[PDB]
Write a protein that binds this ligand. Structure first.
Ligand SMILES: Cc1cc2nc3c(=O)[nH]c(=O)nc-3n(C[C@H](O)[C@H](O)[C@H](O)COP(=O)(O)OP(=O)(O)OC[C@H]3O[C@@H](n4cnc5c(N)ncnc54)[C@H](O)[C@@H]3O)c2cc1C
Ligand SMILES: Cc1cc2nc3c(=O)[nH]c(=O)nc-3n(C[C@H](O)[C@H](O)[C@H](O)COP(=O)(O)OP(=O)(O)OC[C@H]3O[C@@H](n4cnc5c(N)ncnc54)[C@H](O)[C@@H]3O)c2cc1C
Ligand SMILES: Cc1ccc2c(=O)c(C(=O)O)c[nH]c2n1
Ligand SMILES: Cc1ccc2c(=O)c(C(=O)O)c[nH]c2n1
Ligand SMILES: [Cl-]
Ligand SMILES: [Cl-]
Ligand SMILES: [K+]
Ligand SMILES: [K+]
Ligand code: NA
Ligand code: NA
Lengths: 593, 593
């Protein structure tokens, strides 16, 4: 494997130094490169099992087996005397910048994965360009650099969730002795949006400064891959040019879908519009049942809004259905209405949005239930959350040879490579992968290290933990109970479970036996934890550290031997004893023995 | 080991059935015992490696090698035909109740460890008594069943911490768009105390009902161990009697210390008095620097109080000192004053506590700094938090032979056994063990299983995670950085670290580069995580799941291969890259690449 690894490494690296930690010739070259501000990867062969073997293999490229060896874009450029000769003769800049292509890397898409890949690549002396363009929504909404999460996803949705959580905090503060009257306090949408948008603007700016400080070229331009090494760019002036790159990372993400019904595009909005909406949504219908649908419905209700969710079938398809039902039950018991087994037929406009007074319009939504009854109700705002899709026909010419799946996602190897060998795809467009920001970031950073620094480490997409930021949050890592049973059979599955009550809920007079957790375990594999699930406050904080234990193959016994931190919600994972098979109730009292 | 285990098991178990899961004779006995409401342990030999060997060993006690075999208090009572003979002849009640002693177990102390041990023992048919008495504080404060944590510890302190956290929640809610004016809202101490005390009363009651429902005898009586099997009890009427028990668990905990200075006992208070204080503490001096001192100072300041902490030397001795300094810096920057390098000499009374209007008194505290300057300041309340101590001379007669250490704590084996072989000690009085509620609970429950159900599992006291519930919380698991360096040497330690900023702090305009985390790792052991440390909100929820990974031997690579949950504070543990040895700043901007 050594010679194949060295061939791949040398071919792809922009600027790389084969070195040893203790070699003074290696230091003289490093000091020259640092003095010349020449960024590069370094492989210290004295720190590798197969270092002796890599030294021998290097003579296939350079005819030498000594360190240091410096390579540029697939070519041996010199030992220490040669690199110091180019430096002293003012030749070294020209040599380290020599390329068949404008860039070593072009990243098409300036979101979670693309920015992480481009910044990481630049660290190893890849000459990098990041392209980002935000096609406006149908009402004309656009935003700055950073992608879906930063501008219209995780960041603003979690901030608006925090605004919603602070309602319950106002309520609780009265029971804890604070002299405020919750009933007299109102929420101002636009004040909140201004604060969220100021934060997002600081991120848009921060990314532009980070790219400038890493010597990455940022182009606010729509990129189209027209051949393996050619990207056509279209700038704001509609000026069309071609730039060339050695490696191409496709990181273009997805955008909301609309249903094909009259008035949906004209009169509804999506999450892309919600997070900067200049008017308060008012009485709101959310059509959909994804995590986006429920998160948005939930914070809007907690802000004091009249909210209905129109559900075609089930909530949170693909997540553990027991947990999904508990998530929705909590919502229904806390001010969210559900129109169940219901689909929309038409959106009719009753009032146009008021762009001066910043007031919503008014819409008539017609739909129907599975039982044949009509749905007909007025809403000020209608939010579609009915899926997301890539729009790669925009992004790649069909003649380039990048294989897509039946959903228009990119078919990749376990190292993110497409069917075009210099072209990789990361993030939400990579078929089959969890569509999450930290997944796109790890994939992009690890890929950049493989391309430009001879790393071997792949991204592990297994047992990737999630959290749904509904009013009562839901954290999970691993299999749903139903998927565990389908895979291993019911007789090989043991489920430990318990209700719990946050201590913070006691004096606040909140619910007993609503927060809930379970461990789905495999009996024949030492009670291996296949899936962890928790409904409760701060569920992402609870779940994250257990992800490390599950990656390590935690068993039930590993959870039991660990001592709780008291008083916490998370400690309940360390004392679970009630099995589903026993039929014993998972309910709990305050204190027992 | 089998014959030694079987000898110990048979001698100690109150009522035990040796069984196999598939034996219909075993079922007939189980159904009779369940019908007669006779509780017992069961060992299913078909579920043990050495089951075949245990069957053979059983003939040393019973002369038979078949199942079922039923034992009572060290004696073989019968096979299936014999047990059904006693039942049919109304003899079985008398036989299963036959004992040399009043109880199989007497627990002296009805706190975290004792209640957990007694309830667990009762499950296996141990006839159990729990003794609890609360000696009043010097001002006369007392409370109900449940121990330090429930009444004057973790439970009320965390509830008053939540009351304090809700101040910052009121502040934040304005930036998130809520129309309240933080400056107009005040806190009412006594309203809060009423709520906390109502919760505590529900726990006191819950424990009494749980003991009644497990057929445990609860005596509100002071117990004194006068010989290995004899406990002298003194009831509220000062009636003195003796009860006898086979096994004795000492679970009597600790109480606050006072310094030997004039006025301390007469005019100061401790945490024992604070949690039910009927008057608002007002301007408060906390003398001490333990976690109790800082937690209490912190919530009192967040409630709007004028608070000073008098520190003799350092904060949080025994915890990582870098983290301790950050904890205190946050406090000092958020309304806690520190009188550093300062000790008290005298407390003078200026006003008596007002018991009708529920107002504090007034005190003059005289002390001195190491620099020779005098301290002289008025306070309404003075809280001593200057350690806790066991008071076992009260609890055990010196003639019984239970060895204590130089601090008056019980010297125990790794299975909680004292120098008196039937007498065990759990919780805060067990020398050398972390003084934590979940430690006392695991120790007590696991011990009861070893005594009464033939369990072998010991409590693991290593890498027990903690959280200090200061205004900015501090969670830890494993070694401090300084202890890791002392043990392994500086050259074998790598520390990864980062600041972070909760997303919830962005729109709220709270601090950059104050929350902080680090992993202290051992270079020569695959970068094993020796210690994890986090300063930030919800730090107990963050830290708990990583405790499971650390118990499993997590390395840095295990943290890196795990994918973050976004947006959370905890995810920062999955991307740490900056080492202390590098000298690179741990500060972070919002968004970089
Ligand atoms: C409402 C919502 C909430 C979410 N909440 C969370 C959450 O809490 N946690 C979580 O982990 N994930 C969350 N996600 C998912 C997360 O946003 C995505 O997984 C992540 O943004 C995907 O990153 P990416 O790099 O694949 O694409 P994106 O971040 O979508 O970035 C792609 C970028 O490329 C641009 N682009 C597209 N075509 C071109 C072109 N031809 N040329 C130039 N630029 C182009 C796009 O406009 C965009 O700026 C959420 C998503 C949504 C919609
Ligand atoms: C202010 C404070 C905050 C704390 N916060 C936390 C925290 O957040 N998390 C955590 O894990 N730990 C915390 N602790 C520690 C925790 O309270 C203890 O570790 C735990 O209560 C110890 O349990 P135990 O069973 O050893 O003793 P205890 O709970 O102290 O119970 C001993 C009981 O026995 C009684 N007793 C004593 N002598 C006799 C006698 N002769 N006969 C009869 N009864 C007797 C005592 O009065 C008491 O009721 C805190 C402690 C304090 C003081
Ligand atoms: C509940 C309900 C039902 C029908 C209508 C309607 O036709 C209409 C209009 O202006 O067309 C306005 N509002 C309506 N509201
Ligand atoms: C700051 C300060 C210093 C001294 C005294 C004092 O002697 C006193 C008294 O009544 O004795 C009351 N209050 C005081 N306050
Ligand atoms: Cl921008
Ligand atoms: Cl009581
Ligand atoms: K445990
Ligand atoms: K990671
Ligand atoms: Na265990
Ligand atoms: Na990794």
């Amino acid at each position: 494997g050594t010679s194949q690894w060295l061939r791949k490494t040398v071919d792809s690296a922009a600027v790389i130094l084969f070195s040893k930690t203790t070699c003074p010739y290696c230091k003289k070259v490093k000091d020259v490169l640092a003095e010349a501000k020449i960024k590069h990867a370094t492989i210290e062969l004295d720190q590798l099992s197969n270092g002796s073997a890599i030294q021998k293999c290097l003579a296939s490229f350079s005819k030498i087996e000594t360190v240091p060896q410096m390579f540029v874009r697939g070519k041996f450029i010199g030992d220490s005397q040669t690199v110091l000769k180019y430096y002293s003769n003012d030749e070294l800049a020209g040599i380290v910048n020599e390329s068949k292509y404008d860039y070593d890397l072009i990243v098409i898409g300036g979101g979670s994965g693309g920015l992480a890949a481009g910044k990481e690549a630049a660290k190893y002396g890849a000459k990098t360009a990041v392209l980002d363009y935000v096609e406006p929504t149908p009402i004309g909404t656009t935003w700055g650099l950073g992608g879906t999460c930063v501008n219209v996803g995780c960041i603003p949705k979690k901030l608006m969730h925090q605004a919603g959580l602070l309602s319950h905090a106002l309520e609780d503060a009265e029971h804890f002795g604070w002299s405020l009257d919750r009933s007299k306090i109102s929420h101002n949408w636009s004040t909140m949006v201004e604060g969220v948008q100021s934060h997002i603007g600081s991120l848009n700016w921060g990314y532009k400064v980070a790219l400038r400080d890493n010597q990455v070229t940022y182009l606010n331009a729509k990129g189209r891959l027209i051949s393996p090494h050619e990207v056509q760019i279209t700038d704001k002036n509609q000026k069309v040019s071609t730039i060339t790159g050695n490696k191409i990372i496709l990181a273009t993400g997805e955008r909301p879908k609309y249903p094909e019904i009259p008035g949906a595009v004209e009169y509804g909005i999506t999450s892309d519009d919600l997070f900067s909406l200049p008017y308060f949504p008012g009485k709101t219908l959310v059509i959909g049942a994804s995590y986006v649908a429920l998160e948005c419905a939930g914070f809007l209700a907690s802000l004091g809004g009249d909210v209905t969710v129109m559900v075609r079938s089930i909530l949170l398809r693909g997540f553990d259905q027991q947990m999904a039902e508990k998530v929705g039950d909590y919502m229904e018991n806390h001010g969210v209405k559900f129109a169940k087994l219901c689909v929309p037929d038409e959106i009719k406009q009753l009032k146009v949005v008021d762009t001066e007074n910043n007031k919503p319009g008014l819409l008539l939504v017609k739909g129907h239930y599975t039982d044949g009854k009509k749905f007909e109700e007025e809403f000020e705002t209608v939010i579609f959350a009915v899926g997301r899709e890539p729009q790669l026909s925009k992004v790649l010419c069909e003649t380039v040879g990048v294989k897509l799946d039946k959903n228009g996602r990119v078919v990749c190897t376990d190292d993110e490579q497409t069917t075009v060998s210099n072209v990789y795809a990361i993030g939400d467009i990579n078929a089959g992968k969890p569509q999450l920001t930290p997944v796109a970031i790890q994939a992009g950073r690890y890929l950049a290290r493989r391309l430009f620094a001879g790393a071997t480490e792949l991204t592990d997409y297994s047992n990737v933990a999630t959290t749904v930021f509904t009013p009562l949050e839901y954290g999970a890592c691993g299999l749903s109970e139903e998927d565990a049973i389908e895979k291993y059979g019911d007789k090989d599955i043991e489920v430990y479970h318990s209700n719990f009550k946050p201590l913070e809920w006691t004096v606040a007079h909140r619910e007993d036996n609503v927060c809930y957790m379970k461990l789905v375990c495999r009996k024949s594999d030492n009670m291996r934890v296949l899936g962890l699930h928790v409904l409760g406050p701060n569920a992402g904080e609870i779940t994250q550290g257990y992800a490390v234990a599950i990656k390590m193959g935690a068993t039930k016994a590993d959870f039991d031997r660990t001592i709780g931190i008291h008083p916490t919600c998370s400690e309940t994972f360390t004392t679970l004893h009630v099995t589903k098979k026993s039929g014993v109730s998972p309910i709990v009292s305050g204190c027992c023995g």
